[PDB]
From a paper:
Type I exporters are the best studied class of ABC exporters and minimally consist of two transmembrane domains (TMDs) each comprising six transmembrane helices and two nucleotide binding domains (NBDs) that are universally conserved among all ABC transporters. The binders were instrumental to solve a crystal structure of the transporter in its OF state and were used to probe molecular events at the extracellular gate and their allosteric coupling with the NBDs.
The OF structure of TM287/288 features fully dimerized NBDs that sandwich two ATPγS-Mg molecules at the degenerate and the consensus site. An almost identical structure (RMSD of 0.21 Å) was also obtained in the presence of ATP-Mg. Sybody Sb_TM#35 binds on top of an extracellular wing of TM287/288 and was crucially involved in establishing crystal contacts. Indeed, the sybody inhibited the ATPase activity of TM287/288 in detergent (IC50 of 66.1 nM), as well as reconstituted in nanodiscs.
Author numbering:
A (entry chain B): 22 to 591
B (entry chain E): 1 to 124
C (entry chain A): 2 to 569
Write the structure that this text describes.
Amino acid sequence: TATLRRLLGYLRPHTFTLIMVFVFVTVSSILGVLSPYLIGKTIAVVFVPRRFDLLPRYMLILGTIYALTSLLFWLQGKIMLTLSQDVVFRLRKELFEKLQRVPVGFFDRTPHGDIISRVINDVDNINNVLGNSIIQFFSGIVTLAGAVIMMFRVNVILSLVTLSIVPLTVLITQIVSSQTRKYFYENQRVLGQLNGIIEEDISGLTVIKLFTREEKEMEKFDRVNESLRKVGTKAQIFSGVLPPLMNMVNNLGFALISGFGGWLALKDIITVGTIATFIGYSRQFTRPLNELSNQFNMIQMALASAERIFEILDLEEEKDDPDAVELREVRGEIEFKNVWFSYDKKKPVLKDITFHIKPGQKVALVGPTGSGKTTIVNLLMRFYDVDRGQILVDGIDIRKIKRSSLRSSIGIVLQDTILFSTTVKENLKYGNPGATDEEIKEAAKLTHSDHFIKHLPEGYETVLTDNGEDLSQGQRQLLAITRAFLANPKILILDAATSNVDTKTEKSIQAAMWKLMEGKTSIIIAHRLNTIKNADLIIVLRDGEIVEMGKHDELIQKRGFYYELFTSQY
Amino acid sequence: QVQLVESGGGSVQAGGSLRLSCAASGNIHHISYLGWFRQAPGKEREGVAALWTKDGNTYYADSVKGRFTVSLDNAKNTGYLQMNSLKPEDTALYYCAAADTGSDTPLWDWVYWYWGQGTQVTVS
Amino acid sequence: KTLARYLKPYWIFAVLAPLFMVVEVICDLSQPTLLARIVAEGIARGDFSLVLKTGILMLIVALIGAVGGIGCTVFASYASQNFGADLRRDLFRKVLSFSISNVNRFHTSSLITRLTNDVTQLQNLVMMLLRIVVRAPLLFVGGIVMAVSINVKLSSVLIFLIPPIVLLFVWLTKKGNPLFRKIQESTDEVNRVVRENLLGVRVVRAFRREEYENENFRKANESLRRSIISAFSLIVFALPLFIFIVNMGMIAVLWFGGVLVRNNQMEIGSIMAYTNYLMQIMFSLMMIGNILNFIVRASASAKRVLEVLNEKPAIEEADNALALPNVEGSVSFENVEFRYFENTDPVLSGVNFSVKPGSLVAVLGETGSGKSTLMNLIPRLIDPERGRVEVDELDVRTVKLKDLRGHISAVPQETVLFSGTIKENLKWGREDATDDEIVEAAKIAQIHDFIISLPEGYDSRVERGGRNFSGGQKQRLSIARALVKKPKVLILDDCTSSVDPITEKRILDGLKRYTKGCTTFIITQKIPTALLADKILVLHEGKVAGFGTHKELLEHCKPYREIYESQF
Ligand SMILES: Nc1ncnc2c1ncn2[C@@H]1O[C@H](COP(=O)(O)OP(=O)(O)OP(=O)(O)O)[C@@H](O)[C@H]1O
Ligand SMILES: Nc1ncnc2c1ncn2[C@@H]1O[C@H](COP(=O)(O)OP(=O)(O)OP(=O)(O)O)[C@@H](O)[C@H]1O
Ligand SMILES: [Mg+2]
Ligand SMILES: [Mg+2]
């Protein structure tokens, strides 16, 4: 009921239009009972007395009724179709916008296929609470109210007997509906699991093929697929078990009113004809009662899926400080003060990390595999927040500077290069959309990117494949370097930017890069120490701690852990 | 203390006619139902004719239709059943039933019911 | 036609479900007659013995109707869900057989829909059919039989109303079908927008294009709802228009019936019953229209499902493909010419060289030479335009794929791990691998020290793509994964790109000590690591630039010297 109140809340901006829908469906309902009445009247007025001179008039009246009834049905559907899709659109909009506010930590831990499922498969399931579901409910409540008034108009005593069988129908609906929601919520969560497998396997098929895991991934899939078939059958059975069960309940009610009706006839209260009349009037009451009860069992599909939709909508999202400041006239005064960090929040990754960088300086961050170099950077980008310590950008705490301004001042070439499925121009234009075609062509020429871009079938307008896999690994990095330089940040981070870029090209760019790097503060993470030896400051890391700090020549003659790293290169 | 006396049952040849009387004596307030049923030497309870005093509608068996006719005398307090063009197929023990409604009966509690005696009607 | 075979192993339930519906239908049609017998014969005559006789009979026919009703629902749920489950696993089996060029045709996002949403639409059609496949025609034939029994001449106008009906459910087929395809095509776009955002959220946040992506999604979300309202408007117009012609049939019966009674060809009592069975014909006619509304939606999904199943993968095993249980490691390239697209220039051209078994060959060259491409030809991930690739003097095309790929282990340039445990991820190579075997491979990869340091050990959780590990950490896990498989041919694409020089030495000197006899190909950007190899292969601008010892290349190979000078 709690989820139902929330889901029904999406109908509030459509209140007036939904009132019209109710007004039109009530007119359609009174016309729906007027139509067989008029057919019954035509037989008794023109056919029985054999005076067919009146027939064209009664036919014209009946024809106008059918013309109005059909036009109202069209009108009901036309406005409801647009009304329902506006609600479904709002729910899809609300989910995507929410994910853009939700922290990065969520995307790494939760499968992407399950999130994709919740946006399409789960939102598509809240359609059986909208459209004709609203029309049938509206028509159901009017027919039920319109029948119950006609029952007491015939016989009050018998009407109490037909109303006393209603709690039994309500009870069996409550048992069935609870089970329907139980198995349907499970069906939608197993669906997300299966959607997660198909999604991950397609994006890594080459690796599955290379290690002949095609069969082992099939049996992995078959475990979840069989689980989906098992709970999906249970949900489908419970969904349509109520209509034949209610026909059994109606028959018990019919037998009870036949006994009660017969009793009243023997007491001189009513006649035999009244019993035959009341069974006709009870049929116009049981029909909407079973229809509304079956509709309650059907809306469990939307209710179970609504839970999965709302689950994403109530996630603790990334929020800025109420008194947060915007960084104006950025220079590059980066500083770390006794910073401690852990991802799992059990075993520490970074331990008392403390260092100061003056504006303009080109600082190098070297260390072994799993030292915590990317962690230092990920904290500066504020993707994660410090356990105990302070990060100061331009002399202001990172928690006090708004995320919008912080990420505008700081640029990053991530360890793992992520490209988009668009033109080479649009991929480079990302970060700084207000960059001229000449500025893009000049920036690509500087990082030796322009050569292979021109060789493509459409040049800069060549549409790239998913993540830009239609290029060499090194060529993808060159595009990532160009995109970051085009963004023109005051603070630039080059975390393993030339991992797959050859030493010949690496030497060629470095010379032209310095001119586009001067007057800007930069943090360069590299395992190719021979490139970062020219840096103003070298921060040597090991086991999440700063062991050595200073210039290349100073650290080499010190014969420390930096010397051991530099010598190991040959 | 209401008792029903049955009289008028004898041997009649095929295509003939015979009237049956059902006299009721006691503290009768208002009769609501009057019925007649035939019983074979190896059958439970059947249904031949019925009368409801509120409307006057008569409900007969499928074989009877336009043969037997049920009636009741108000002043005499006696039920009647006229049998016309009798076929040898309806050779059985005929009975009587009468439902009376007394002054001020409870909300859910019913009134009384009274059965006849039984008289043999043989048709060959 | 091919999709019908998926229901064949569940034919028992497929024939019982519509049969159980008939059992319910005969019981529900008996309801007005059995309720009439209890009142007009039971209560009316007064005999309490007939009241209970009909009373027990009505409650028994309701129980037979209930058993028949629940039976139909159960048997229809079995056959439909099983149809889908079997089709989903046969589609995923086909998707697993695909190459990347096949996955590039049906976009990754579209395939997700084809395996989930497109199956659901076909599954629901089978479910809809199972319940009303025999219920709708029997009620329609039985209805018209009752109309002819009353009056044959009046039943002639029932034939006259079929032309606008047939012209309407054909219009719903021609206009309907491509519009439901556009909904399924629009779901592929909303899948693509939500997929690219999930797989690259850090780039979106870092470049602040969050508002841009919300608009990128709004453009796809609006295009989706516009496709839905445009295809469902086709039903909200046709259904009331059909209902109108249906109700016009009553006026046609009353008018012609009036002429019949005026000419004394029909009775006045006959018209009272005719009105009831005419509505039954019309109600049953609506069910024939409803199946067509489900057929047009399912037909768009059936085309999308079938084209995936009918798609032949780029790499396929030969009919006379020789099984390779044992390999030596004789990798040979016979005038190999490769192109990713016909329009483009050759990616690899005039590539002719041979590799000795067990020998270590260092692959070098500038970014975009074709090193990664040249390696992918060996485990038959790609096939050349002209020329042939050979393993053990045998053309890789004429050999069984599972056998060939089993003996060739690779460490990709862009390391990708999978969701599960470290132990599961390392067993990717060899499933029959011992706990000592996986520990030995991780000890050679220097990753063992890290795995044991974790609280869960080898059973520690691995996220999608190995996002919960550092750059060189997942790289060291990929080396340990390939080592487990115990290969005869090993491929290492920039093996230690994200690994420090100290750990780099421990891995490289570790590999030379335990990968003896295995033909190892090592792609490297470093001369010191390249000197370890028996022979050095150098690529430049697609064609093979050089092949031989360090000394031979310094004196003859111009790009090798250029690479040497950049370091020394
Ligand atoms: N998302 C994450 N969840 C959990 N642990 C993480 C995550 N990212 C990194 N770690 C852990 O943090 C530690 C250091 O990570 P980090 O990426 O900063 O190392 P690194 O110094 O950059 O090494 P490399 O050069 O090999 O990438 C490792 O033990 C790693 O497993
Ligand atoms: N999937 C692909 N589709 C189209 N072109 C591709 C594809 N993969 C690579 N290429 C192109 O083929 C050429 C060489 O490919 P390859 O990836 O093997 O280069 P590489 O020598 O390994 O360079 P690097 O060391 O940077 O990875 C490049 O021009 C590249 O853009
Ligand atoms: Mg890193
Ligand atoms: Mg490569």
